[PDB]
Design a protein around this nucleic acid. Structure first.
Ligand code: ZN
Ligand code: ZN
Ligand code: ZN
Ligand code: ZN
Lengths: 73, 79
DNA sequence: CCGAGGTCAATGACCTCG
DNA sequence: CCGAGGTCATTGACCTCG
């Protein structure tokens, strides 16, 4: 099976120029819409997985932009 | 903070309904009892419940709560 | 301090639509 | 057929209180 390149969950296809899951797809859509700026409480080095994606939103949004999620919509 | 959740292994503050559990498994057990919801597993009823994939199957997550000795009667009625 | 109770913003499964 | 868009029931961090 194909996995989401951001967190490693079961990806549901390509969303915003990246093979992501429904969780990371919705998170990346809300982040750009609200122009939200997060602050990591662990020094910006959180390893991204299914558990850490709900904890740190800074390292999650950084992981999405590192995996090529475009925001042209 | 200083305890381990008996269902998924997350950080547990103390005992809830008799068992060490996290804020996630505590509310999940309360919601299931107060609303009397019945879940249905999509696999062989052996889904793994840990820190990262506890939300995978609601059935096997509730079954582990009963297996770890969570008392359903410990859930009071809605005030 | 402990274990009940509670709220509610963020989350994510699942929807319609072009 | 996919992926844009959307809704909305669940999740879990953060509370009060005796
Ligand atoms: Zn993901
Ligand atoms: Zn982080
Ligand atoms: Zn737990
Ligand atoms: Zn299951």
């Amino acid at each position: 099976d194909e996995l989401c390149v951001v967190c490693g969950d079961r990806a549901s296809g390509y969303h915003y120029n990246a093979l992501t899951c429904e969780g990371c797809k919705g998170f990346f859509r809300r982040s750009i819409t609200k122009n939200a700026v997060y602050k990591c409480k662990n020094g910006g080095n959180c390893v991204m997985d299914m558990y850490m994606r709900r904890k740190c939103q800074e390292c999650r949004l950084r992981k999405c932009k590192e995996m090529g999620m475009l925001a042209e919509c | 903070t200083k305890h381990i959740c008996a269902i998924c292994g997350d950080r547990s503050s103390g005992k809830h309904y008799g068992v060490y559990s996290c804020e996630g498994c505590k509310g999940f057990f309360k919601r299931t009892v107060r609303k009397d919801l019945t879940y249905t597993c999509r696999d062989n009823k052996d889904c793994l419940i840990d820190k990262r994939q506890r939300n995978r199957c609601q059935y096997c997550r509730y079954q582990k709560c009963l297996a770890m000795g969570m008392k359903r009667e410990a859930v009071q009625e809605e005030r």
